[PDB]
Amino acid sequence: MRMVDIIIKKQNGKELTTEEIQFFVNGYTDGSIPDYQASALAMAIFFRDMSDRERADLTMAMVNSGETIDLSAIEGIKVDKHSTGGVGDTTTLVLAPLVAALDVPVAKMSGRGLGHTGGTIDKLEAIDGFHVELTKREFIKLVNRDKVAVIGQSGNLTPADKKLYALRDVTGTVNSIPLIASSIMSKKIAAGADAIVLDVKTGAGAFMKTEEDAAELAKAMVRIGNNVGRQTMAVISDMSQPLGFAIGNALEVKEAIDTLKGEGPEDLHELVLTLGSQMVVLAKKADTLDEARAKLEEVMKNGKALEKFKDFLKNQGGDSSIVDDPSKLPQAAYQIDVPAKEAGVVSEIVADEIGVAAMLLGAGRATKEDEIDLAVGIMLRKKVGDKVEKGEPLVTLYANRENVDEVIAKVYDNIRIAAEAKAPKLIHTLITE
Amino acid sequence: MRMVDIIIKKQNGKELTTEEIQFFVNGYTDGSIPDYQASALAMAIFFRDMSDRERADLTMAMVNSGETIDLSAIEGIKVDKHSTGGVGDTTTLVLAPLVAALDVPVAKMSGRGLGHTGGTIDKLEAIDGFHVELTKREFIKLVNRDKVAVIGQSGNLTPADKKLYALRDVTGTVNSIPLIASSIMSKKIAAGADAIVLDVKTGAGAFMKTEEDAAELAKAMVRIGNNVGRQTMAVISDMSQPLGFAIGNALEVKEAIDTLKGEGPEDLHELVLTLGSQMVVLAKKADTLDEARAKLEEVMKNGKALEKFKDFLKNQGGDSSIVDDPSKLPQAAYQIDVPAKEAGVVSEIVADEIGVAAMLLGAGRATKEDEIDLAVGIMLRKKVGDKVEKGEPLVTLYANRENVDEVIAKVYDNIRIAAEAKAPKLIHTLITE
Numbered sequence: 001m002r003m004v005d006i007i008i009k010k011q012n013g014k015e016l017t018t019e020e021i022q023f024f025v026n027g028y029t030d031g032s033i034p035d036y037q038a039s040a041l042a043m044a045i046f047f048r049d050m051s052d053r054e055r056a057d058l059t060m061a062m063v064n065s066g067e068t069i070d071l072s073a074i075e076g077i078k079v080d081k082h083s084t085g086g087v088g089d090t091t092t093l094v095l096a097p098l099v100a101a102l103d104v105p106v107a108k109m110s111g112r113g114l115g116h117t118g119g120t121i122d123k124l125e126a127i128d129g130f131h132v133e134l135t136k137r138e139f140i141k142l143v144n145r146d147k148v149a150v151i152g153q154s155g156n157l158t159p160a161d162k163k164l165y166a167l168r169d170v171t172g173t174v175n176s177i178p179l180i181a182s183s184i185m186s187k188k189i190a191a192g193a194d195a196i197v198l199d200v201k202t203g204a205g206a207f208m209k210t211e212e213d214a215a216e217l218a219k220a221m222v223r224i225g226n227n228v229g230r231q232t233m234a235v236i237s238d239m240s241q242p243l244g245f246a247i248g249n250a251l252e253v254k255e256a257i258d259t260l261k262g263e264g265p266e267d268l269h270e271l272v273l274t275l276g277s278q279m280v281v282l283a284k285k286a287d288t289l290d291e292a293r294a295k296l297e298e299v300m301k302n303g304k305a306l307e308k309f310k311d312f313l314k315n316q317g318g319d320s321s322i323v324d325d326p327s328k329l330p331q332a333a334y335q336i337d338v339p340a341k342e343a344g345v346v347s348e349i350v351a352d353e354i355g356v357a358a359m360l361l362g363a364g365r366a367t368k369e370d371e372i373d374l375a376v377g378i379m380l381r382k383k384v385g386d387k388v389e390k391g392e393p394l395v396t397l398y399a400n401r402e403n404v405d406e407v408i409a410k411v412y413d414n415i416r417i418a419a420e421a422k423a424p425k426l427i428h429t430l431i432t433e
Numbered sequence: 434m435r436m437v438d439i440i441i442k443k444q445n446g447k448e449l450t451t452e453e454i455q456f457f458v459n460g461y462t463d464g465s466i467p468d469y470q471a472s473a474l475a476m477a478i479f480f481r482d483m484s485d486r487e488r489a490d491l492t493m494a495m496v497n498s499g500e501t502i503d504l505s506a507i508e509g510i511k512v513d514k515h516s517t518g519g520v521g522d523t524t525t526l527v528l529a530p531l532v533a534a535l536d537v538p539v540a541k542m543s544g545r546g547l548g549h550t551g552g553t554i555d556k557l558e559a560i561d562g563f564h565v566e567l568t569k570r571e572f573i574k575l576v577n578r579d580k581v582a583v584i585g586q587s588g589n590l591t592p593a594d595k596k597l598y599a600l601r602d603v604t605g606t607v608n609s610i611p612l613i614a615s616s617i618m619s620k621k622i623a624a625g626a627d628a629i630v631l632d633v634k635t636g637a638g639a640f641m642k643t644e645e646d647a648a649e650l651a652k653a654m655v656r657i658g659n660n661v662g663r664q665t666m667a668v669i670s671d672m673s674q675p676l677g678f679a680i681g682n683a684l685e686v687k688e689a690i691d692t693l694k695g696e697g698p699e700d701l702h703e704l705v706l707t708l709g710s711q712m713v714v715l716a717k718k719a720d721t722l723d724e725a726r727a728k729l730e731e732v733m734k735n736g737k738a739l740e741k742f743k744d745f746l747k748n749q750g751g752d753s754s755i756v757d758d759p760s761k762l763p764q765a766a767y768q769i770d771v772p773a774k775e776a777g778v779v780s781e782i783v784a785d786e787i788g789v790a791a792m793l794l795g796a797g798r799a800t801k802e803d804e805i806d807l808a809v810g811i812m813l814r815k816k817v818g819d820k821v822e823k824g825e826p827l828v829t830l831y832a833n834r835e836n837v838d839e840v841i842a843k844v845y846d847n848i849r850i851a852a853e854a855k856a857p858k859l860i861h862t863l864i865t866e
């Protein structure tokens with residue numbers, strides 16, 4: 001009735017009103033408005049775009065479509081990192097302890113979910129005894145005291161976004177700057193964050209396939225965050241190749257422990273710092289990025305970041321001695337190398353497919369009620385740019401299974417070697433203002 | 434997925450192939466493809482548009498989506514006319530006998546439908562005893578014998594177009610040159626016509642409301658016709674004001690009778706000849722529009738037009754004495770003049786709203802559950818660009834009801850008077866080749 005007019009407005013490129021947008025969102029949420037109108041409207045948006053102002057109102061409408069987490073009791077400026085997927089991305093594990101060591105409040109809400117590897121709870125619960133068996137008041141007290149904690153995600157956060165994305169996927173309206181940017185910021189504002197850091201991924205193995213688009217989507221999200229009082233910043237990092245060497249769960253925790261001691265991979269280290277700096281700044285604990293970086297690099301060297309991880313673990317029941325002795329983490333039975341069939345420099349490592357290969361070991365959930373094996377995964381022995389002689393291992397598979405032929409195969413199909421090869425820029429672009 | 438890829442292809446301005454299009458049409462018709470995909474696709478069509486090849490494939494996809502009538506048993510080239518909706522339009526009542534009298538096979542398929550006045554069949558009810566339904570044999574016999582017959586559109590001709598229209602209407606994708614050009618041509622090609630004449634309206638009333646867009650839609654529909662070998666021509670006629678004086682059913686039959694004697698209103702007469710000329714040329718009963726026109730004007734003055742009308746009425750049970758004696762047509766109870774409040778020239782007769790006013794007397798159907806009163810209607814006393822004194826009748830309301838104050842008010846509010854005015858050119862342009 002009124003939807004059809006809003007669609008036609010949108011066709012002509014007319015900037016919708018706050019109430020018009022809220023009518024669609026709530027009408028679509030409660031089942032008043034059917035999906036053929038929603039999809040029609042989604043495509044209309046795809047072509048004629050939305051203003052910075054329509055974005056901010058759409059974003060906020062989706063927040064209010066379901067529950068809103070109030071973290072007013074938690075003290076300080078709580079900054080929340082969002083990443084746009086990334087194979088082997090260990091930043092979340094490192095960042096929460098690292099940033100809390102500088103008295104920045106980290107109120108993590110995380111899950112398990114489906115993917116190449118497990119969620120942050122899955123990965124953390126490889127630390128013997130660790131749990132999220134705790135209330136909201138327990139959660140609030142721990143963040144106020146030790147500046148870090150993690151609970152499970154709530155059920156009903158932005159059910160508008162859930163249904164919209166699902167429609168967008170099956171109508172090809174996913175790739176839209178206003179819809180993506182709103183969809184993301186909505187989940188993070190509903191989750192109760194004050195400020196937000198974004199890790200928008202780019203490269204051959206990324207959702208925003210080009211840096212042109214990456215920087216635009218990121219810029220769109222900053223301006224949304226600023227237009228609703230949520231100071232936002234953004235990194236454009238590369239994901240043509242997996243981040244670090246560890247692709248797994250126990251493997252990635254081991255790698256997080258290394259980076260917490262200043263002993264991480266070149267790439268994971270750098271990204272952790274860049275992202276960490278943005279957070280530390282967003283909670284008024286430094287003036288500029290370099291000072292934050294210095295402070296963060298100090299707490300790596302201090303072992304204070306590392307002790308903040310142990311505190312955090314023992315606060316939630318995890319055996320903190322496992323941080324000191326990583327070999328206590330669940331071990332894989334078999335340890336199988338994948339040797340180069342060729343000499344040269346490693347030119348290409350198809351991130352997602354290496355991710356898939358690790359999933360095939362048991363490391364992630366292909367379906368709703370699959371079970372993760374925390375021990376299994378892939379440790380990269382070479383990165384894009386390293387030399388390699390025929391027979392030298394590119395990769396070591398970690399399995400509780402003798403037969404890994406399908407996995408070895410997927411590794412070879414997705415690691416190319418050439419005469420020369422230059423590793424892409426990891427950190428492309430930061431967006432502050 | 435398939436459909437998603439088809440949608441995305443179109444998003445990027447790629448030409449759909451023939452198989453993709455059939456898959457969609459067959460899929461959406463049978464129920465495989467859901468409504469939200471269909472709506473997202475049409476919205477993609479709307480923006481990126483299609484090519485002549487795609488339009489042709491879409492058209493024919495829609496033709497084959499249901500049953501097809503095969504008039505091959507009727508000898509000669511069976512040309513058919515389609516008008517894009519016009520208030521007071523009686524050209525079909527005139528053309529069918531007028532062109533059949535020149536030995537052009539009119540195998541007309543018409544419907545009742547909703548709107549301002551009733552359809553062609555509704556109008557033909559006014560001659561008592563006339564009926565629409567007789568057999569496909571009785572249809573084929575009568576056209577070979579007398580070159581003229583009218584039956585109902587029945588079953589599912591273009592079931593894809595039935596469903597997709599409703600979708601386009603309720604999703605705001607009705608105004609797309611590809612979609613309507615196909616929608617029109619499909620239903621016509623499906624009805625068994627060899628050649629097609631299109632009366633594409635323009636002006637205040639009618640869906641297309643500019644001479645540029647009207648020609649664009651026509652040139653598209655002609656091209657599709659020539660592409661599929663169904664030789665097609667078009668008339669761009671004006672419809673900012675109603676056609677002739679008579680707006681109704683019994684009233685429009687009377688007006689069509691006058692026109693058949695060459696005693697019609699100027700505009701109706703001119704539109705008839707232009708449309709007729711085209712039909713005669715497409716039927717190979719003249720080499721020249723000039724020649725064709727002349728034959729049609731001879732047959733009007735002869736009586737041969739009017740005798741063919743009588744023949745046609747007798748063939749389908751109609752009391753053909755009503756032609757010779759108009760007062761036999763169902764008369765109206767009341768006959769109210771609407772006096773002008775102002776001296777001047779009549780500048781504006783808002784065609785669609787006058788059609789509504791006539792509807793409010795009982796001459797059309799707002800909803801499917803209404804019944805037409807055939808007696809009622811509106812006789813215009815002035816056309817745009819006529820001098821009118823204060824107190825002179827602009828309009829006469831033929832009613833079967835005493836209180837008609839809303840109808841009077843609507844007439845006043847949709848007929849403006851000014852110092853000077855000229856009506857548009859009736860015949861704007863023609864698409865011959």
Ligand code: NA
Nearest residue numbers: 088243244246
């Ligand atoms: Na890693």
